[PDB]
Amino acid sequence: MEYEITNYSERHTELPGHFIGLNTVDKLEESPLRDFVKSHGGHTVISKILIANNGIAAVKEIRSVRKWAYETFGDDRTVQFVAMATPEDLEANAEYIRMADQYIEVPGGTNNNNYANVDLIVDIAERADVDAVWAGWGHASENPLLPEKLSQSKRKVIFIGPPGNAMRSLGDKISSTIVAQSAKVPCIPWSGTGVDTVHVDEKTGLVSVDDDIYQKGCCTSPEDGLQKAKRIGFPVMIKASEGGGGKGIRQVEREEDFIALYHQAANEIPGSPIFIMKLAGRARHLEVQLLADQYGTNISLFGRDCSVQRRHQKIIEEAPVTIAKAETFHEMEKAAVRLGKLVGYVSAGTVEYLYSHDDGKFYFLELNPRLQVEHPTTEMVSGVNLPAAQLQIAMGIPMHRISDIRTLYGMNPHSASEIDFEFKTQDATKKQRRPIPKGHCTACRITSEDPNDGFKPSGGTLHELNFRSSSNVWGYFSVGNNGNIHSFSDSQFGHIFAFGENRQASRKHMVVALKELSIRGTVEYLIKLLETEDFEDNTITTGWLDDLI
Numbered sequence: 001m002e003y004e005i006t007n008y009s010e011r012h013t014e015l016p017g018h019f020i021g022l023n024t025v026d027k028l029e030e031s032p033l034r035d036f037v038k039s040h041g042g043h044t045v046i047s048k049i050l051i052a053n054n055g056i057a058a059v060k061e062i063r064s065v066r067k068w069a070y071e072t073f074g075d076d077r078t079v080q081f082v083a084m085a086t087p088e089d090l091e092a093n094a095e096y097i098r099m100a101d102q103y104i105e106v107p108g109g110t111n112n113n114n115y116a117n118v119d120l121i122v123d124i125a126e127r128a129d130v131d132a133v134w135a136g137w138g139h140a141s142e143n144p145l146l147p148e149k150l151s152q153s154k155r156k157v158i159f160i161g162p163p164g165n166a167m168r169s170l171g172d173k174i175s176s177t178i179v180a181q182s183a184k185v186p187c188i189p190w191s192g193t194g195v196d197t198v199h200v201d202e203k204t205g206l207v208s209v210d211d212d213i214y215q216k217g218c219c220t221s222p223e224d225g226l227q228k229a230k231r232i233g234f235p236v237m238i239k240a241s242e243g244g245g246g247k248g249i250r251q252v253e254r255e256e257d258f259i260a261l262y263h264q265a266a267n268e269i270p271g272s273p274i275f276i277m278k279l280a281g282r283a284r285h286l287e288v289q290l291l292a293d294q295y296g297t298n299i300s301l302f303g304r305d306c307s308v309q310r311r312h313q314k315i316i317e318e319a320p321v322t323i324a325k326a327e328t329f330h331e332m333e334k335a336a337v338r339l340g341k342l343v344g345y346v347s348a349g350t351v352e353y354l355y356s357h358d359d360g361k362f363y364f365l366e367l368n369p370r371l372q373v374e375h376p377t378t379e380m381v382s383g384v385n386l387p388a389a390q391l392q393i394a395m396g397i398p399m400h401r402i403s404d405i406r407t408l409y410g411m412n413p414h415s416a417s418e419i420d421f422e423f424k425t426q427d428a429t430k431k432q433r434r435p436i437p438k439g440h441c442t443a444c445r446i447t448s449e450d451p452n453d454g455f456k457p458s459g460g461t462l463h464e465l466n467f468r469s470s471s472n473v474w475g476y477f478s479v480g481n482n483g484n485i486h487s488f489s490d491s492q493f494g495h496i497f498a499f500g501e502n503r504q505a506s507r508k509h510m511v512v513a514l515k516e517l518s519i520r521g522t523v524e525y526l527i528k529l530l531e532t533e534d535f536e537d538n539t540i541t542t543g544w545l546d547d548l549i
């Protein structure tokens, strides 16, 4: 078969070498896959992928890509998958291992010994002679050394995700906020407000902040920090930029406690720079789904509202966002895009925001440089197969030649016409359709207890739920093997996704599914949360669930 043609050869010359793989279209024999990549403007044929993950992540990657492969080439194995298999996963007969076209055994224990071990991943990538590695979420997905070492290999292995430079462009909290401010993204009042000068390596695009600028947002002494705190207004947070987890951080309610608490945080992470920031109160946590190709094009795929949290853990999330005014969320989308373009982002990513419904303002929190477990919420309302889009982007195919994206913008999916994603001109508004979310999706995190008792557990590590009473709901529970904290566990986590024509409908469908599920040997509190007046009226906040407890 033939396709409409895109010639991006000039643009290919500008791309950093780490984007280019070994099997480039120019020196490759004709084939369905090669023809597709070439005609669509891509540079490298990715026909074999190593999955540096397990559980639901590995299963989702395989199913999403194989579905795209089948729809596109009539052969769902056009792009092969190699799996990494720990003794724990092998012993549990994990589905992803059985699904993969091939697999390689790896050491057990915590993930630093396997799925998150960069050197091992690179070694296996070479041994398996793969074209690319997909990490997804968790494990080493956010480790810049992964794409860097993969590209340094003589096998020139591609990373299906953002480049190391993009991940590094957003360093500690201080450097990260300054970069955001340089991209004109509103940030929470802090000791560095106004500091927005960044340095971009004219050759690598790596974004950094010179020491003389970085220090502009740091405290020179406890007394200096107090002065900065007074200006910002109490309560504030004292934070050591090099702080780990919950160390090097202290909330200050009153001036009188500042100095003492400053030393407490400083002493936990000695020598670390310290910055002051206003304390976020009960508000909203919104996310913008970012998708970027290798040619500077960053777009948003609407967003998600994950305000309902417990101990900072997302429990209930929905897409698209509805609490914010349409134009205000569009501003969050645009700011996310500005940031993505600045750090040279590529692939899927999320920009998190703090949003106050009382005054309608929003503030940057962070950019998670990875695809998230709850991504199907966004996939459902946008119609975009995200793992397939990531794969095409990794092959060098531009945003406008990704079929699901063309469909989202109301274009003929077979056409090669350029798309103006910013709708800047009358011509663009004439040939394109502004994306509109299709329906609504509610996602709930669910937990289960399946103690390891010697008895052979139900085969597989991904237990799927096929609801008999609901038509718009799907869910799963997964055995947590080889985590960073637990190599195996009695507890099992998962998610349930429910679709509806609108917020009320998806909510209703979720409740119906949960009730059906509750007829099994957990989700009882979820049903109550979903049927509360506050949730129904959408008057919840980031502190809502914690206040109920």
Ligand SMILES: CO[C@H]1CCCC[C@@H](c2ccccc2)OC(=O)[C@@H](C)[C@@]2(O)O[C@H]([C@@H](C)[C@H](O)[C@H]2OC)[C@@H](C)/C=C/[C@H]1OC
Pocket (backbone or CB within 6 Å): 059, 060, 063, 064, 067, 376, 377, 379, 380, 383, 384, 385, 386, 387, 441, 472, 473, 474, 497, 498, 499
């Ligand atoms: C682990 O694999 C599960 C994942 C299900 C995720 C929930 C489900 C859904 C969302 C909301 C409500 C109900 C169900 O989302 C979907 O089915 C949609 C969005 C989606 O993920 O389907 C997958 C792809 C075509 C693509 O990525 C995307 O389509 C654009 C296919 C491969 C389905 C795989 C499933 O296995 C059969």
